[PDB]
Design a protein around this ligand. Structure first.
Ligand SMILES: *[C@H](C)[C@H]1/C(=C/c2[nH]c(/C=C3N=C(/C=C4\NC(=O)C(CC)=C4C)C(C)=C\3CCC(=O)O)c(CCC(=O)O)c2C)NC(=O)[C@@H]1C
Ligand SMILES: *[C@H](C)[C@H]1/C(=C/c2[nH]c(/C=C3N=C(/C=C4\NC(=O)C(CC)=C4C)C(C)=C\3CCC(=O)O)c(CCC(=O)O)c2C)NC(=O)[C@@H]1C
Ligand SMILES: *[C@H](C)[C@H]1/C(=C/c2[nH]c(/C=C3N=C(/C=C4\NC(=O)C(CC)=C4C)C(C)=C\3CCC(=O)O)c(CCC(=O)O)c2C)NC(=O)[C@@H]1C
Ligand SMILES: *[C@H](C)[C@H]1/C(=C/c2[nH]c(/C=C3N=C(/C=C4\NC(=O)C(CC)=C4C)C(C)=C\3CCC(=O)O)c(CCC(=O)O)c2C)NC(=O)[C@@H]1C
Ligand SMILES: *[C@H](C)[C@H]1/C(=C/c2[nH]c(/C=C3N=C(/C=C4\NC(=O)C(CC)=C4C)C(C)=C\3CCC(=O)O)c(CCC(=O)O)c2C)NC(=O)[C@@H]1C
Ligand SMILES: *[C@H](C)[C@H]1/C(=C/c2[nH]c(/C=C3N=C(/C=C4\NC(=O)C(CC)=C4C)C(C)=C\3CCC(=O)O)c(CCC(=O)O)c2C)NC(=O)[C@@H]1C
Ligand SMILES: *[C@H](C)[C@H]1/C(=C/c2[nH]c(/C=C3N=C(/C=C4\NC(=O)C(CC)=C4C)C(C)=C\3CCC(=O)O)c(CCC(=O)O)c2C)NC(=O)[C@@H]1C
Ligand SMILES: *[C@H](C)[C@H]1/C(=C/c2[nH]c(/C=C3N=C(/C=C4\NC(=O)C(CC)=C4C)C(C)=C\3CCC(=O)O)c(CCC(=O)O)c2C)NC(=O)[C@@H]1C
Lengths: 647, 36, 169, 161, 160, 160, 160, 161
């Protein structure tokens, strides 16, 4: 399996274009309200739509009759309708028995599905659904189906739909032209596939059929020609600002460089030269270079100029070396004066975001580019490309099975988790079921249960956390100290145990009206053991309110396991177990399961208060990789400082 | 004026049919026809 | 991208070792099999379009729901995209055959395949089935053709099956 | 988590203002549609397994997802998917009762996408599954209740997307 | 609110709301109009209640406004009346919510640690809320104030 | 009972009853005569409910009465009628208590383990209570039926 | 596999494989040709065993194919025979691997929760494997039948 | 984890068909090598501490790593490195018995780099120590099975890259 995941954000491909879709998206890409044009697109469609309902309603009802009259004309030698699911060029009627039942079932359903897609075409009001699904169909159907028989079948249906309807010339012509498009697209052979050639050796070459880029909403492409009237020239410049700055900033804040605008309006500098000068401008520098790391600003510079994310590990490595050498100008210069930029946009065309629909996509930087094309990209300040690309070659990282966000910070108190929304730093990794996470023991390294399972109930001797035990006799256990004995020495020890037992369940010491006084005195009397006392504090409504309720279910399970057992979960096997209990039984039973677990009983007895036994490598790094606490012999060469021989 | 109510008014219920065994289980459909 | 030569270099470079007897023998095994690997690559280059189409035709007869409604191979747009994908897997296995290493198969195919297929709604089960049908189509054609070694042909397609498919057990 | 009442209180508390005329109107709006929410919840409570059953039946059954190689083939995975749909319906009901989608953020959509990507679960398939809930829910719960339930289930879809 | 508390309790046992908890919400919803009347009357004379109950406090416990007392001084008396306005605002949140959770989360949890650090007697703040109840009950009608005083009585009970 | 459920919730936090908790008992005790009316109607025509809803189950799912089924024969049919009579008795205990705890302690906790050992489909027992709800709702008034069905729906929900 | 379970048990105790454990793998690899013969026998009658077990199940339990049943209609009966074929294949994987983990991870772990959503009697599917075992033993020898039965009985035991 | 058997089972299960002729051939090839696999495992089981001893003496002992300033200087750190090499030899045997390096990805190299970076464990010196195991194991077991063991020992090394 793969060791890294870039993310799997929802992809929404446009299967076919409708009139409302074509109208709305036209102004959406331009970042405008629907003007007198785009409103009139809808107005004429909504008026005709009532008639377009009557087209389909007749054709949906009489669908059985159209396909029956078609199949009878085409297929000879029996009845084709036994197993229902004008210009002849030179067709020969196909025998029913000779063609075979399996081929006949295909033939019949396609004839119905051709008419079905015609009815959808009128209702949509755009023959896009036809153009896509009919263009590259002649070639694939040629193998085991005659083309000559299909043309006359559609032409029969054209006449069949004409005679059955026949209302008005303003009504029937919609039926006629859509059928006329249908036969013309079917007569047309399969066009050449769109070949996305790799710009260098590092990036793979791709191919996309001439059907996928026929529906998936074409990105509006603006080119600065010197003769254009200044209204559409303004539309080009606004689009150029919408590409570089992700949004129209000249409308928002009136932030515009008129010095550069004037030169492009004339034709002194090209759009290639404009993008160059605009991306090295202090206006871009402040917004997409200054707030970001060198790696992330590089990743943003890719989508602004080239209109795509970095494709390969080698590409990020190359372009980071450029931005380290000469900075932002040198990076911009490398991006504009590339073989890719001049191939896609040339000199005149404004850069555009080439995503799922525009071109063929590679299976490498899918989710990394999906989040990048979003407007929420310049808030993810953690790089997504260089992180995933490096993690691809490496094995599985030190991470919780349900992501990096599921890992809490290894602190004394407070369940603090990285938020998915606030500062996107989600790092998915394909963890399987039987994947045990390597955990660092607080005590001796030999006392790890992975290598030494017998030494699970061994106390950390001044290496890890302090162990609290009810070793000493509880006050008022035996009737030796009769009535009096005001100075019973064994009283402060059990109270310190209670406080520590509170400190383990809830990281911090609680307030006055939060302490369970009933549970405390039962432990002090010797009615319940520590195991029962820890269980009661974790079964408290306060623990539910503070740690369980405000947090994500599996985050709350993970933190509870780090508090009750003092250990992060090894992997899926344990996490799925408690998550199954959380679904069926509830929170209280999850508490019960973690206490009544065998590993709890082995590590901590009936008198032992739980403690931090194991840390995550990331957690220990936070503790012992700071300026202090770090030893000299961790990751540094130690030279023996000896007095010189001349001294 | 109240013709504008499409998403604000009463939603039109859509018929979604139960998904049936397909021609992958034609072997088993043949078996179920002979199990009588 | 890494071949069997580069993988062996990287393995010995990591440890900082000169190429020993075991290293030279593994290279010699590659160079002797290389002639059969190019000849196998010449076979699939000849029958690139024919295998892809026939393997798809077998797949849509095995799992008919793909080319039926609600299926992800229903429309012409989907049918062209699936045959393109089948063309991709054969093309990258073509690279993997000569390379004798599944690094090219990992880096440019498998790395972000699960993420993409889960996004659009592309099935991952019928996919690896379609890859395995292609494998059986190559192996049978390689058995028919005058080829001495045919065992290396199964390697890239099985790796394509292992990495992409869900862990059942 | 916060409900519609708590949302008004917390907004007044952060400003440090007493409940003004606009705040009283916001509460009265929630108290107008409260009997509807309680009656809606009792329907979902009864047909807890039934809604999930039909949702899988209309979308997920006899598909490539439940077929071998899929992410819902094995019985352990099928039960885990059912478990997820049981979570989604219950928390949507809570949000419907609350009149706020704050619970869905705190409990469900805090780190669900990162979990699903790590597991390799098709989000596209789950979005279709929760959309399948939406129709089955509205069939039993009603129109105005179905519109309310329709919003919160779409919010789960929005968070996953 | 009471909706929030019911859901949290339901999620704790991983179950849909019991018809007892459903009956709890629906009756609160129908009897919400009376709860908004209480909040309106408390808001309407918010500067009347605090002023009167403060005067009752400094008469019953005058050691508070004596040298050595925590609320001794023109600035310190003002802060006490500011505190009394907070708890009155907390009450209005509690009555509206139909639950004592908003009073707890904001102005009851860690109140003992707060007034200890400030050097304020907790029993005297309990007296101020007790006198706040008496003035509020005088303005409202018999049955209306009786169910309104229960929220005051919690603030007294949690502090004293 | 709703009184006991309130007490055990208050005892868990080690506190007195909430203003909302006391109000709910007050609302229960005032509407106790209405809850007694629901019981008296259901106890009066108990045999007519289970007979009709039984027959309505047997026409919907005849596989039960058919050979191979759990309730095959006139003796086993009478057992199924008794099972529904036992569950109708649990609802009557549930409505007077104002809580679903009495229904849980007797005939809900460990029911899935029971009917497994008997080999009875629990979804069919869930459907029998559904029919019992329908006949009872048509028997008595709609204002009382909405309260009665709320406890019925819990029995359905826990069964299924 | 018998290897995988041996490794897991050894890893849990943090030790190398026991001389007893190594001998069981030794007995496995030597009898590798024997267990692959049983699999081919089960694969040979992949449409015969589940056919006969199907017919035997629907005569013993006709409530399944009766109206109101889970497998009512030709479409649903096909899905039942599909489940039969799945479990037979799962035993086929089990006898090859010589382990119950390649069986449990696919179609035993969370199977009660799985069939609950579909509304399928689990004890009826338990009888489905019982009929499969008897037919499979009929179209086999004597010594290898007992080895095949052991993994079949696990499928019955974990389901029932 | 996945062995050579379960890998064939996994591949057949996701296809949704019985084990074919090609699947049977892959099993028989493993069972033929299985005699050499168990033999090698038993020798490594008996000679477990001795292989580690020879490996530490070859690379680690009388070096800067074991001397003051090094990471294998401290006694708790020395015993850790012994145990670490006790892991590597054990799990390499596990993978050798399995026929796949799946266990190494799941347990051994599962965030091993981040573990070793946080503690300050030398990456170069540990790789040489595994290579020291590799050389000793091959000289102790044989030229065929020791080379077969060496594949998985190189897999740990390449995983630490
Ligand atoms: C030297 C002290 C240690 C060290 C460094 C090291 N770094 C890389 C590669 C990269 N460096 C960075 C980090 C940054 N990006 C930023 O934006 C900033 C802040 C301005 C920094 C410092 C990144 C992202 C890379 C990746 C680019 C690349 O591939 O070169 C390496 C190379 C690792 C590799 O080849 O994959 C190294 C070695 N590591 C050590 O060993 C030293 C102790
Ligand atoms: C006081 C100087 C300022 C202030 C404090 C404040 N803190 C919290 C809550 C928490 N404090 C911590 C931090 C720590 N965890 C540790 O391990 C340590 C070192 C021992 C510390 C200091 C944590 C984890 C929390 C979270 C909740 C908890 O108590 O466990 C709050 C409350 C935040 C909330 O909204 O819950 C506050 C207000 N803030 C100010 O206004 C002061 C300037
Ligand atoms: C020949 C007289 C008739 C015929 C036979 C035929 N059809 C198929 C299968 C397919 N049909 C299509 C076509 C469509 N895809 C679309 O999007 C639409 C709507 C505009 C249609 C009608 C496709 C793509 C297939 C292949 C998928 C499948 O297997 O169903 C076949 C099988 C092809 C083969 O030999 O592999 C045959 C023989 N179809 C016609 O057009 C005639 C009416
Ligand atoms: C055919 C075997 C199956 C199938 C295919 C299918 N895939 C898509 C969508 C995409 N396919 C890819 C994947 C790749 N591109 C790569 O670079 C590689 C590595 C070499 C692969 C495998 C991508 C990126 C897309 C999306 C954009 C694009 O088309 O380039 C579709 C389209 C889905 C839709 O309807 O939008 C289809 C049909 N689907 C099946 O059902 C078959 C089992
Ligand atoms: C069902 C609609 C589809 C589906 C679901 C599916 N999900 C998983 C995996 C997990 N789901 C979660 C997520 C959650 N954590 C939470 O806190 C909550 C409640 C708010 C949820 C929903 C988790 C933690 C897991 C992992 C559990 C585990 O370890 O097994 C699976 C299991 C996949 C696997 O076993 O690898 C499944 C099946 N996927 C589909 O195919 C359906 C379309
Ligand atoms: C026959 C013995 C009994 C029976 C069967 C029945 N099953 C279903 C539905 C499903 N069966 C399964 C189970 C499996 N899929 C797996 O992956 C495995 C393990 C290898 C098994 C055994 C599943 C997941 C389904 C869903 C359908 C699908 O996957 O496409 C039905 C259909 C019921 C419905 O429509 O809801 C039936 C009838 N029913 C009986 O009464 C027999 C005793
Ligand atoms: C003399 C009292 C006994 C004895 C000594 C002996 N020791 C070794 C090997 C080592 N001893 C240590 C132990 C330590 N070094 C440390 O850093 C510390 C903590 C401060 C201790 C206690 C180590 C690490 C070594 C390895 C040597 C190296 O630096 O490489 C040997 C050599 C063993 C061999 O044959 O290789 C010997 C002889 N042995 C006896 O018989 C005496 C009873
Ligand atoms: C010896 C080859 C080199 C070396 C080793 C060394 N390791 C540690 C500490 C730990 N080792 C691990 C790693 C693992 N535990 C696992 O579960 C696995 C997978 C099977 C492994 C390999 C862990 C977790 C620790 C932390 C302590 C613990 O046991 O929990 C140390 C000590 C570091 C310290 O300062 O504490 C050392 C020295 N380092 C060398 O010098 C050798 C080259």
């Amino acid at each position: 399996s793969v060791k890294a995941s870039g993310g799997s954000s929802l992809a929404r491909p446009q299967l076919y274009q409708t009139v409302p879709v074509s109208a709305i998206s036209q102004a959406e890409q331009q970042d405008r309200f629907l003007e007198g044009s785009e409103l009139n697109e809808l107005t004429a469609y909504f008026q005709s739509g009532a008639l377009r309902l009557e087209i389909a309603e007749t054709l949906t009802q009489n669908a059985d009759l159209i396909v029956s009259r078609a199949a009878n004309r085409i297929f000879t030698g029996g009845s084709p309708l036994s197993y229902l699911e004008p210009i002849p060029p030179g067709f020969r009627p196909i025998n029913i028995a000779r063609y075979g039942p399996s081929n006949m079932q295909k033939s019949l359903r396609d004839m119905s599905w051709f008419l079905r897609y015609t009815t959808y075409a009128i209702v949509a009001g755009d023959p896009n659904i036809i153009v896509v699904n009919t263009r590259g169909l002649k070639e694939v159907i040629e193998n085991a189906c005659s083309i000559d028989a299909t043309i006359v079948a559609i032409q029969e249906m054209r006449a069949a739909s004409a005679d059955y309807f026949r209302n008005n010339a303003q009504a029937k012509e919609i039926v006629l032209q859509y059928f006329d498009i249908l036969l013309s697209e079917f007569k047309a052979p399969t066009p050449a596939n769109k070949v996305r050639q790799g710009p260098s050796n590092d990036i793979q070459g791709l191919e996309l059929p001439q059907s996928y880029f026929n529906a998936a909403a074409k990105r509006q492409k603006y080119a600065m020609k010197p003769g254009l009237s200044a209204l559409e020239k303004n539309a080009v410049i606004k689009a150029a600002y919408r590409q570089i700055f992700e949004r129209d900033i000249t409308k928002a804040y009136s932030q515009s460089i008129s010095y550069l605008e004037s030169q492009v309006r004339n034709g002194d500098i090209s759009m290639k030269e404009f993008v160059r000068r605009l991306a090295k401008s202090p206006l871009y520098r402040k917004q997409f270079f200054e707030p970001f790391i060198n790696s992330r600003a590089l990743e943003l510079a890719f989508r602004h100029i080239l209109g795509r994310g970095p494709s390969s590990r080698e590409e990020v490595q190359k372009y980071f070396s450029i931005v380290s050498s000469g900075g932002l100008p040198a990076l911009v210069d490398a991006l504009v004066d590339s073989q890719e930029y001049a191939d896609y946009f040339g000199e005149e065309t404004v850069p555009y975001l080439r995503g799922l629909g525009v071109e063929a996509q590679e299976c490498r930087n899918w989710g990394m580019q999906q989040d990048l094309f979003s407007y929420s990209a310049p808030f993810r300040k953690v790089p997504q490309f260089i992180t995933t690309f490096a993690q691809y070659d490496r094995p599985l990282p030190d991470q919780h099975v349900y992501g990096s966000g599921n890992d809490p910070l290894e602190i004394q108190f407070g369940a603090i988790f990285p938020k998915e929304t606030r500062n996107p730093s989600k790092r998915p990794a394909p963890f399987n079921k039987d994947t045990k996470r390597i955990l660092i023991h607080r005590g001796p390294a030999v006392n790890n249960q992975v290598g030494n399972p017998s030494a699970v109930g061994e106390f950390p001797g001044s290496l890890g956390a302090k162990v609290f035990r009810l070793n000493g006799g509880l006050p008022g256990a035996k009737v030796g100290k009769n009535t009096g004995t005001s100075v019973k020495f064994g009283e402060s020890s059990t109270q310190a145990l209670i406080r520590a037992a509170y400190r383990q369940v809830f990281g911090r010491d609680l307030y006055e009206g939060q302490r369970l006084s009933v549970a405390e005195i039962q432990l002090e009397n010797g009615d319940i053991s520590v195991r029962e006392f820890i269980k009661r504090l974790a079964k408290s409504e306060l623990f539910l309110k503070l740690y369980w309720a405000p947090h994500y279910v599996c985050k709350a399970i993970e933190y509870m396991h780090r508090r009750l057992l003092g250990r992060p979960t090894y992997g899926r096997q344990e996490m799925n177990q408690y998550f199954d209990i959380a679904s069926k039984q509830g929170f209280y039973a999850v508490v019960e399961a973690m206490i009544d677990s065998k590993e709890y009983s082995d590590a901590f007895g009936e008198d032992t208060v739980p403690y931090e036994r194991y840390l995550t490598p990331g957690g220990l790094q936070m503790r012992s990789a700071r300026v202090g606490s770090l030893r000299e012999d961790i990751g540094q060469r130690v030279d023996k400082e000896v007095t010189p021989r001349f001294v | 004026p109240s013709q504008v109510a499409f998403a604000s008014g009463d939603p039109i219920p859509q018929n979604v049919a139960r998904r049936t065994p397909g021609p992958s289980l034609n072997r088993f459909k043949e078996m179920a026809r002979q199990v009588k | 991208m890494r071949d069997a030569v580069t993988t062996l270099i990287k393995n010995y470079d990591l440890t900082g070792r000169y190429l020993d007897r075991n290293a030279m023998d593994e290279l010699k095994a590659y160079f002797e099999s290389g002639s059969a690997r190019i000849a196998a690559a010449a076979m699939i280059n000849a029958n690139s379009a024919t295998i892809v189409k026939r393997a798809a035709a077998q797949l849509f007869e095995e799992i008919p729901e793909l080319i039926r409604p609600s299926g992800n191979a229903y429309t012409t747009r989907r049918f062209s995209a699936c045959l393109r994908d089948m063309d991709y897997y054969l093309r990258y296995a073509s690279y993997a055959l000569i390379a004798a290493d599944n690094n090219v198969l990992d880096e440019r195919v498998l790395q972000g395949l699960r993420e993409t297929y889960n996004s659009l709604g592309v099935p991952i089960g019928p996919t690896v089935r379609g890859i395995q049908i292609m494998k059986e189509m190559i192996e049978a054609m390689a058995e028919d053709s005058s080829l001495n070694s045919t065992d290396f042909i199964a390697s890239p397609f099985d790796h394509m099956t292992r990495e992409l498919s869900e862990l059942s057990v | 988590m916060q409900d519609a009442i708590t949302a008004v209180i917390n907004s007044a508390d952060v400003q440090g203002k007493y409940l003004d005329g606009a705040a009283m109107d916001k509460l009265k709006s929630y108290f107008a549609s409260g009997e509807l929410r309680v009656r809606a919840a009792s329907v979902i409570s009864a047909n807890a397994a039934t809604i999930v059953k039909e949702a899988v039946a209309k979308s997920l059954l006899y598909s490539d997802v439940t077929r071998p190689g899929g992410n819902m083939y094995t019985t352990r995975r099928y039960a885990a998917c059912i478990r997820d749909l049981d979570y989604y319906l219950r928390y949507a009901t809570y949000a419907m009762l609350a009149g706020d989608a704050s619970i869905l953020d705190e409990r469900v959509l805090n780190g669900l996408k990162e979990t699903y990507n790590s597991l390799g679960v098709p989000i596209s398939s789950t979005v279709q599954a929760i959309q399948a809930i939406k129709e089955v829910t509205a069939s039993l719960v009603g129109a105005d209740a179905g519109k309310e339930m329709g919003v919160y289930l779409d919010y789960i879809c929005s968070g996953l997307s | 609110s009471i909706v929030t508390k019911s859901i949290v309790n339901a999620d704790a046992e991983a179950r849909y709301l019991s018809p007892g908890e459903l009956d709890r919400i629906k009756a609160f919803v129908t009897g919400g109009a009376a709860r908004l009347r209480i909040a309106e009357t408390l808001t309407g004379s918010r500067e009347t209640i605090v002023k009167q109950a403060g005067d009752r406090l400094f008469q019953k416990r005058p050691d508070i406004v004596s040298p050595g007392g925590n609320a001794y001084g023109e600035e310190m008396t003002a802060t006490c009346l500011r505190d009394m306005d907070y708890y009155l605002r907390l009450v209005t949140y509690g009555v509206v919510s139909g639950d004592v959770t908003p009073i707890e989360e904001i102005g009851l949890v860690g109140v003992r640690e707060m007034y200890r650090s400030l050097g304020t007697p907790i029993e005297a703040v309990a007296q101020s809320v007790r006198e706040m109840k008496e003035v509020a009950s005088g303005l409202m009608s018999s049955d209306d104030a009786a169910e309104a005083s229960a929220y005051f009585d919690f603030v007294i009970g949690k502090m004293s």
